[PDB]
Symmetry: C5
Subunit: 174 residues, 5 copies
């Protein structure tokens, strides 16, 4: 017996519009990993199919549930009909206005197969204000390599936002 | 003590209109099998009667709960009043517009006692577009026998839909 | 610790109108017995008092909870103010229109202290159509005795309804 | 880990108006004792603080949770601002119209520190009809002492109400 | 498997407006500690991230979850964009009108890093009525030192409010 109700308490009911189901799963995925440990592709497939309830159209098989990124990407092709990387710039722009830059980096990297150069370049255009772009680049440039920059991107954004008095959604205190 | 609440988290509350209770059970049946193992006809009868709550009219006895298909079919005769195979073409046409082709194959086969020839022929008429009909037939024809075609029908539909840029409900990206 | 939440998942919240609380408990009683075994009068009293929540007026003591029938009957005297058998014909007529004949036989026998002759005679008047009355009587008459007829009444109604194409609520396919 | 969810299934969400929180706790207290055993003042304090959720204003300390009566009385001084016994007659009159006489005896005795003479005298004025007052007094007078009358008051009200055809809220069948 | 559902029963769903999420966590924090014991910074981080569900913007790392005060303060900088102590007087004034003085002392001390002198001085201005200010000061002055006054502040407010017939929100009985 998989403990579905604890997982259902963290996630909640699926979104009504089929198009917003892939983004929802990506945002709730880190919290699920902390509350319950998922160690095999088969366990992940059973949890995702139960959370979405009776959606035969969006059912996933054990092969496509190797990593959380693969599961979120497959749901995108079933809900939208296009592979994600073809229109990544538009998808990141929608998340930034509705949720914020930190949500866009996490979901953009899941859909982009962990490509730091493409995600960092697209996000830099939509960062809030000229000062934020210059300050963040200086801090990231000091890091030794692309792997180290990828791990510390969210930590370096939070420090810059705090100095300039911006909330998570980028709205100024003034 | 059967763990009803985990099963209730996956399913949800029964539909208010008595006519849509049989289709609802069919869509939620695969997810229930993954979360909790059902191994006997008696266990299935107790789970179905609890999920529908206090519906004395639609109660099922252990004899008619031998397989999930038998349980869904018996509810159809109590909710609608006609055996399913008498009007299968109309039932499949309703599911395709509301949910999609993949939901119609799974529920059509449960109501049709696993008849591949009748279900495949009815679905081919309602497939979206002339190109989808020709492409799917070529892939299915290559398979060795009817049992092998039945197992791979959903896998071969998903590949064709992805090439032609169609979502699960059959709506084009254009 | 009694497992109240599993029992609450099957039942649901009590009805707002005090008059419909006795019928609600009768319909949900068979499902509760399957999910959790109730073996003593004391356990039944604790479960019924928790399900109704904080209703001091309708609280039941261990003495009146000997059988599910005794508990449903006592709630009727507290909600309505009259003993049930005094107005049984009217109560059965209300259930038949709202739910169906099968619900009326189960709840009519609980309120009537398992009297087959009174319940069968009252139901025969409200059966749907002249043909249903004649067909059911022929099948019941063949049975050896009143105990055997009481066990097989619902099974013999379902067979007659299926032949004449009627749904559980008695509405014809035509 | 205290099993809060089973206790939350019996109780429900707290009332929005701060004034009706003390009466709500009193009505739900007997059911909680049956489902889960509370044996220490500390356990009671932890359960009451969790049920009311995040109400820092109405938080209770282990010292004032010695008995369920002490906890309900302390919430009355925080929600209303006056000790209960100062205005007991008005409080009992409100409960009788909204819920009934049986709810008023149970909650009146909790707020009145188990004083039979004051609660019985206040209730006798608001009993429904002249006949109910005379019949109940005759039965209570036969009992040997005040402790015996206190235990059998609700049992003797239910018998009188049944003979005169009154529902729990005191409304006649006519 | 962390028992998230018991914690979710005490807390409830997060507030929709991002600005009121920090105050909500502070009010629900004492109840969570009683129901489930939290002994490590890592366990606290996993519980807070699950309770807020899928909010990537307000996610907290193990380093900033050393104490409940540190977690509530970090959420304030992400939701509002300013450190709390810069505008403490305004924050305490909002809580006093909406909830009461007792909620303002508990949340004011969490945001102010346990500074008794600043919190006590700000609260004294917003206490209800001239008599309450004089009576409370006399009782607090008798205590030996600032640590002893901090522990007994809520106990000494409740005694003064009871003598002057005030409810928790400061509204008089008159």
């Amino acid at each position: 017996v998989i403990p579905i109700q604890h997982i259902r308490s963290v996630t909640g009911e699926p979104p009504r519009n089929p198009r917003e189901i892939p983004i929802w799963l990506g945002r709730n995925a880190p919290a699920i990993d902390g509350v319950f440990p998922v160690t095999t592709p088969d366990l992940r497939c059973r949890i995702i199919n139960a959370i979405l309830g009776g959606n035969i159209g969006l059912s996933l098989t054990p092969g496509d549930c190797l990593t959380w990124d693969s599961a979120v990407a497959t749901l995108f092709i079933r809900t939208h009909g296009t592979f994600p990387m073809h229109q990544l710039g538009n998808v990141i722009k929608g998340i930034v206005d509705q949720e914020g830059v930190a949500t866009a980096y996490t979901l953009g990297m899941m859909l982009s197969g962990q490509n730091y150069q493409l995600v960092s370049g697209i996000i830099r255009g939509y960062l809030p204000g000229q000062a934020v772009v210059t300050a963040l680049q200086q801090r990231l440039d000091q890091e030794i390599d692309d792997q180290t920059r990828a791990e510390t991107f969210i930590q370096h954004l939070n420090a810059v936002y705090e100095i300039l008095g911006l909330n998570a959604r980028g709205q100024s205190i003034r």
